[PDB]
Amino acid sequence: INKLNRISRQMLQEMGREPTPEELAERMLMPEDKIRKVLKIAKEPISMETPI
């Protein structure tokens, strides 16, 4: 995940708008499904006491 963030933070700047996951899997060496599941890994879910 840290490597994905690094490569994306670099590629968006160098490539324009943002790296589409095909573009990351190409720039990285991953198979583009592993990248998609890595993207789909949820993050720090939420406090269920959050206001509405």
47 binds, options other proteins, ligand 1N7, none, Cβ within 5 to 8 A by partner type: none
**Could you say whether residue 17 binds other proteins (CB under 8 A)?**
yes
Residue pair 7/27 in contact by the 8 Å Cβ criterion: yes
Q: How far is the CB of 46 from ligand 1N7 (least distance, A)?
A: 6
Report the C-alpha gap between 12 and 34 in whole angstroms: 20
Q: Please, what is the minimum distance in Å from the beta carbon of residue 46 to other proteins? A: 14
Per the CB < 8 A criterion, the answer to whether 11 and 4 are in contact is: no
Residue 2 within binding range of ligand 1N7, rule CB under 6 A: no
